[PDB]
């Protein structure tokens, strides 16, 4: 199932970076996450926390800075389903992160931390990961 899955980004990511995450949402999944982290330590700051919640039918976006979570943003409905595969694109621009789900633009999350702080991508939770690619 390959979780928790970590992808190190020693030189960071620039505007024009695409994170492609594919996987299956297992039959009794509660929630999973894709984190863009500043370091490898526990509780590391997070430029992006992408959190589909199957049990509450929401998709939460947040950030973590100086150990404190920001204010949650929510996307429109849950474009994931228990027992169904998915494809997510997280696209970094100069202005924020574009979340694409199932070939449809889903939500835009404005930068709160500098994009230059990102050093790691972490995928975890109730997800059976197909692949994580970083272009």
| 18: Cβ contacts below 8 Å, ≥ 6 apart | 89, 90, 91, 92, 134, 135
Q: Which is nearer to a copy of itself, 74 or 98 (CB)?
A: 98
Distance CA 120, CA 113 (A): 14
Please tell me whether residue 85 binds a copy of itself under the rule CB under 8 A: no
Question: Residue 16, interface with a copy of itself (CB under 8 A)?
Answer: yes
For a copy of itself, the binding residue among 95, 110, 114, 116 (CB under 8 A) is 95
> Which parts of 49-78 interact with a copy of itself (CB under 8 A)?
none
Q: Tell me how far CA of residue 23 lies from CA of 14, 42, 62, in angstroms.
A: 25, 24, 22
Is residue 17 a contact residue for a copy of itself (CB under 8 A)?
yes
Cis upstream peptide for 133 (omega within 30°):
no
The total of other beta-carbon atoms located within 10 Å of residue 11's CB is 8
40 or 95: CB nearest a copy of itself: 95
Our finding on whether 35 is near a copy of itself (CB under 8 A) is: no
Residue numbers in the known binding site for a beta-D-galactoside are 69-75
Q: Note the residues at the interface with a copy of itself (CB under 8 A).
A: 14-18, 20, 89, 91-95, 98, 100, 103, 105, 131, 133, 135
């Amino acid at each position: 199932s390959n979780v928790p899955h970590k992808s190190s980004l020693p030189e960071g990511i620039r505007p024009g970076t695409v994170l492609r995450i594919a996987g299956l949402v297992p039959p009794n999944a509660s929630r999973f996450h894709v984190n863009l982290l500043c370091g490898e330590e526990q509780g590391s700051d997070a430029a992006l926390h992408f959190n589909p919640r199957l049990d509450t039918s929401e998709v939460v976006f947040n950030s973590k800075e100086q150990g404190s979570w920001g204010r949650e943003e929510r996307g429109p409905g849950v474009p994931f389903q228990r027992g169904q595969p998915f494809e997510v694109l997280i696209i970094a621009s100069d202005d924020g992160f574009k979340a694409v789900v199932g070939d449809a633009q889903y939500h835009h999350f404005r930068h709160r931390l500098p994009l230059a702080r990102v050093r790691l991508v972490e995928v975890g939770g109730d997800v059976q990961l197909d692949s994580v690619r970083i272009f």
